[PDB]
């Protein structure tokens, strides 16, 4: 089956024979909702195509004809196969030969839709995967040095607070650590600043979502212009004496042809509208997820030294590559190492009380 | 077969190509009853759909017509394929053209039910799996330090009891250990306290069960409103001269069409009711599991130092995240390490006798 | 084929993707006779279902009709498909319309039997596998310390017997070893003591066997009440003018329908009785196994120190969890380590002669 | 195909998912001729069943009818399907309605034979595999200590023979080694002695062979009583007016049915006789292989110290467990270690010459 | 299916059984656009061939005939199979017997196109893969020595700049490093010098793209010369009395043959034009990609010592092997090692400011 092949040729990963290395293992280069949107918008036309060719209808004939009794078996087969390629309602109302080509082109239309909804995926894989992968690996590598540099080399501050009045050292001493050379990363503040003035991944994300939106609008136009007209039309009077049979003696207007699979066509025309009006607001939500700043976890991120640079860069127009990279990082911060200490600081959600709260919690997070 | 694909596309794990690491190995993120409920409520519509399309009926025709002898083979095939898309019992009792569309839509209805019962599963995997996995890994990591800190570093209490009168040291000495710095964990009492006031996973669990309950109720409404009416209706008098055939000379009311697969429809309509009235009280039991506090094993848990914090937090309204995490932990406490010492203390189920019972058992549980 | 899927979905292990660890490798949680009983009672209905749908009959029609010559091909197909859903022998003896629904429901009855015989298996896997696995692993771990503690640390008794008169030391010295602290396990005598008074797995085993017994009795009732009546009935006079065809001119009583696959039905009705009469006494023997105490190997077990506790606990009512534990242990005692020394002591089957017999055999069993 | 499944469900190993350990790797628990006998007696009925259902006959009809020209297609199909379930030659010679049920039951008979010939295999796997495996592993483990104890620790005898007159030391010195403590195994002479008086595996072997012999005799009786009568009977005059058709006007005795696949039945009835006449004397040879003692290699086995115990036990009634165990050992003695030195001593096949022959050969077999 | 085999025989890698070593792992010997162009230009004819042979049309007959009623079934089958091999419109307009062979040859034409579009791929694999692989491995092997030789052995320049006035040492000291023996590679300037004057791979790339361009032009000529004429021609009057049937009495001019799958032919003739009009400008872009020099990243490459040689050789005619090797290198520069430091220097995109910018960034890129 064609859908069987398209199941793995598309709708999944088509890079390398896998089991290669850290190129894809441990790295999530697609958001979960983006993945589910691609899955639904790619497999649903394929699923409908399979249902058209499924066991629900054991092949048979997609069209039938009421040929007169004088016709033999072969003549009737010819007259019912000559209407499946000359679909023209020769109505008596001049001679408006309305066509019914969408019924024949429905599997081809579904294949075209399936191939069209894979264009945003290919664009994402070819124009954003390498750069975003490099940026994410870079950021992860630079931020994994924020545990052996925020507590282990900052635990002498414990030795100085415990000697003197600890509440006083909690506020009058931290400026020495803040002015230390090793305390802050000397290149993150430049990497992020360089990425702020660049618009390379925001355009790619916006194009990837807008392609799906525009293709959904085109699908609506297709199903509202070509369908919805031949939707309750079940009998069309075709004609075979429109050529070399004109000089014959048999039914000129072979009235009352019938489309056997009209119900399947009607079901598909509604299932390709409902399952896309489901996705219409989801794409808009994905678009708005980039245009809105996030400050819900800034309180704990600002306390950490390395993430202070990310927290400070919170101002300006929302559309920067920093936004996309941060959206991807927050979905990938907890790979194997940050999955053990960053999740600790969720109790701080209510700087007077925050000054003393780390009197026991911060040192209690020691690995041994 | 579509069911063959849906067997692995759904009804199983669809995350990663597996063999990745400790993300899923050794971690049970679904309760066994939840797993069996999902299996039964997802595969049963798929199984019934497969049975409708199985070898039990070698395809054939799902509808038959008593066309007159004047009709040829092609005319009869047309007149029996024009009733499978115009199912309308033109009764003589005005002209109540009762429809029989559920017979046609039954495979589509079963597919819709199968896709609808997978919505709670997807909601669970997308909204609770990461947070609950992080919480369970955190709790397991913090509780695995309760064996090299409850007996190995507490075996000096053995040295102090054996020198003096052991029964006296059994009650006047434990306060020194209870007030020790290392005896109690300094962050568990805050992690659990923070999780008390957060309602995040309790809402997800309630929603996941309520979605299945509401969908079962919707299935009951569907099978009681559309079915149960066309249930003993086997012959419906269709009509084909309702259009371009009106100006013809043949049977106007082609009486006595017949639904060949009515028995299949009747069997499905009862099997989709029985196997869901089976699941109706199980979902309620799953819901009541969370709403009821558990104290059957508090006696041994309170004795252990780390689990004393869990045992003390036993008061309040039942709906907290701690109950969900505890229900998941008690099904996952015995992974590889607690499977050797926690199962020992089942003899204590009847603090005078309990004061002396550990005179030999506690030290006898040594690993060497 | 449905049987092809049910071969692996049921009738085998459905836990984990395997190759995980020591959870199942080296551990036998099902008795061999229980395994073969499940195999036969689960696959036999599936095998009969496959044989009904096998190549032995190339599909065809499960019913045939002697329609008059006036009927066309389509009319005869309709009149032979309108009786596979209206099986009613309209006998002339008032008007006892005896039904022949078991012929239609036989594949569904076989599927119901296959799913019903899997209920005891699911009950065993969900209600007794974890607890029994924990108990067996615990007991094996505690008994593997009975080789480096029964000869290696007891070989100084060789040094004390060889210096003095060895026959005298064979009887006057063993009391010092029997009163030693390390000679006896200090927690086995309590674990087994707690396990005798607990009835948890004995009830599960009784229920698992009784479910199969009750389901076999229900199968006998089903095949004796619904079958055995339509067993030699091959021709039943149907009726098609029982509806909208009443106002027609054709055979009212379309006599002599015929069930083409009656021989298959008769073969199944006897094969599902014989192969369950085979299993009836086997289940009874499985129940008897637990109800009778075993003392055939007590002579050698009592000599060993660790197994002396098991040997002493031989009195009381037979139904205890310890009985099931011992039954599962004796089928799993020889995993990899006891497979080399416990099998040695089979010569002792006839305490005067037994006092001396270990003069050479016991020390000769040394590992080097 | 059913034969496709039975190819791996039977006729092979059905224990564990394999790749487990030394339970089956390197251990041969079935004799090669026993394996070939099981293969031939199990797959041959399966092969004949497949041939009956193979492409050699493209399905078609196993029975044909000479219905009169008045009959239509459906009437003829009914009358040729009503004789395949009412096989009764209504001969005119009173009214001896000879039945031809073996033609219908031949695939079922072949399946019954295939399942019956697998009973001895299951009996062997369930009643003797564990005990024989334990015994063989025990014997191999104890005999692998016969190389570092027969030459390496006996090479000081070389030092004493070379100093004095070597021919004299070849006969007056060996008694000191024969009386040494470490020279002889102190438990093999008791293990074999205990096994001599136990008849456990000999009965199992005799039962396994006798079951196949009795089942072959039953097959002969089946093919000589039910077959060989309907063997040249190709046309039988059936009757359909033996019921509700009695009050009709058509051929009362529908003469001359025909069994289309009679030649297949004739070929099977001879191929299931010849292929078992082939196996009749092989089973008897397997039975006699245990009843006859073996002394062809005693000369070299007696020279070796460990095998001297096996060689000495050369008297008594043949039926003992050591006969079976030695038959299995001689087929498994050369696993990986005895495959290098035991095969050396084949030149000694003609104790005067044997006294000196080891002057160079015995020491030349050194591993370095 | 033939397309199923051609899916893996072509359209993928056909060298070695894979899992061999570093011959293909980590090396990208095809550009992504070249890969996608090959995929589309190879699978699209195969996909159209599959669609012509797919379930969209359940085989049937590719031609139909209006044979007179006197014809039987066999005569009509002969007269409709004698025209699928004698497609000749015997028009009455002298006797222009126009042929319709493209309808018969369309699957063969698609197979020929699929095999023709694979010729450039085979040419690339056989004439450029070994040499280009050797060159790329050589180049990466030589440039991997540009990290432990540009900062680690140049960090003494830090020691000399920090002692004196750092801005002065930034411009008056670098000439000593530039004249050092180890600073510059002594063979890269000769390898590249030899490679500029050699035109070996540029000719191969030009031929590979020009073959696809010429084959697309040939496809256009084929579909514009043979097709587009029999495009709206559905009925052609055949003739069967053109042989030994001339002396017969039946329809001489058997009018109105009909091509049942004409719509499939029309769809293919347009899908093989549009899908290649899509590829026409892409091939031209691939050709121009080498004809244009690249200087967008020269600023950072010139700063690095090893890449200074590549940056300097920027002059001359665009067609050299060096351009091909550079185009392949920039698609493979970030394999596993340059993926961590080369991506750092993207901030430099605006030598006064550049003199000081490395005051902190260059040393901050240290591996520890």
From Swiss-Prot, chains A, B, C, D, E:
The keyword Transport applies. One of its GO terms (biological process) is monoatomic cation transport. Keywords: Cell junction, Cell membrane, Endoplasmic reticulum, Gap junction, Glycoprotein, Ion channel, Ion transport, Membrane, Transmembrane, Transmembrane helix, Transport. Signal peptide: none annotated. Residues 1-38, 131-211, 285-368 are cytoplasmic. Glycans are attached at residue 70. Residues 60-109, 233-263 are extracellular. Pfam families: Innexin. GO terms for molecular function: calcium channel activity; gap junction hemi-channel activity; structural molecule activity; wide pore channel activity. Disulfide bonds: none annotated. GO terms for cellular component: endoplasmic reticulum membrane; gap junction; plasma membrane. PROSITE patterns: PANNEXIN (PS51013). It catalyses: Ca(2+)(in) = Ca(2+)(out); ATP(in) = ATP(out). It is found in: Cell membrane; Cell junction, Gap junction; Endoplasmic reticulum membrane. It comes from the Eukaryota. Its main location: membrane. The keyword Ion transport applies. It is a multi-pass membrane protein. The chain crosses the membrane at residues 39-59, 110-130, 212-232, 264-284. Regulator of osteoblast differentiation by functionning as a Ca(2+) channel in the endoplasmic reticulum which regulates calmodulin (CaM) pathways. Allows ATP release into the extracellular space and activation or purinergic receptors. Homoheptameric. Belongs to the pannexin family. This is Pannexin-3. It comes from Homo sapiens (Human). The gene is PANX3.
């Amino acid at each position: 089956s064609l859908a069987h092949t398209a199941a793995e040729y598309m709708l999944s990963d088509a890079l390398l024979p896998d089991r290669r290395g850290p190129r894809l293992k441990g790295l999530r280069l697609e958001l979960p909702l983006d993945r589910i949107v691609k899955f639904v918008a790619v497999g649903s036309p394929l699923l409908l195509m399979s249902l058209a060719f499924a066991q629900e209808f054991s092949s048979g004939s997609p069209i039938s004809c009421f040929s007169p009794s004088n016709f033999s078996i072969r003549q009737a087969a010819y007259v019912d196969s000559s209407c499946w390629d000359s679909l023209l309602h020769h109505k008596q109302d001049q001679d408006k030969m309305k066509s019914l080509w969408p019924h024949k082109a429905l599997p081809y239309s579904l294949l075209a839709l399936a191939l069209l909804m894979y264009l945003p995926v290919l664009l994402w894989q070819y124009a954003a995967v390498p750069a975003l992968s490099s940026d994410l690996l870079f950021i992860i590598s630079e931020l994994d040095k924020s545990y052996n540099r925020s507590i282990r080399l900052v635990q002498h501050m414990l030795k100085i607070r415990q000697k003197s009045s600890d509440p006083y050292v909690f506020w009058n001493e931290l400026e020495k650590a803040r002015k230390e050379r090793y305390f802050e990363f000397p290149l993150l503040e430049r990497y992020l600043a360089c990425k702020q003035r660049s618009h390379s991944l925001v355009a790619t994300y916006l194009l990837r979502n807008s392609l799906l939106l525009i293709f959904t609008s085109a699908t609506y136009l297709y199903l509202g212009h070509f369908h919805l007209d031949v939707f309750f039309q079940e009998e069309f009077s075709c004609s075979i004496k429109t050529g070399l049979l004109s000089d014959e003696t048999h039914v000129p207007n072979l009235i009352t042809c019938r489309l056997t699979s009209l119900s399947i066509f009607q079901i598909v025309s509604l299932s390709s509208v409902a399952i896309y009006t489901i996705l219409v607001p989801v794409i808009i939500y994905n678009l708005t997820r980039l245009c809105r700043w996030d400050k819900r976890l800034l309180s704990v991120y600002e306390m950490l030294p390395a993430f202070d640079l990310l927290s400070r860069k919170m101002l300006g127009c929302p559309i920067n590559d920093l936004n996309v990279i941060l959206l991807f990082l927050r979905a990938n911060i907890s790979e194997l190492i940050s999955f053990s200490w960053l999740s600790v600081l969720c109790v701080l959600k209510d700087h007077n009380i925050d000054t003393v709260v780390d009197f026991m919690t911060l040192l209690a997070g020691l690995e041994p």
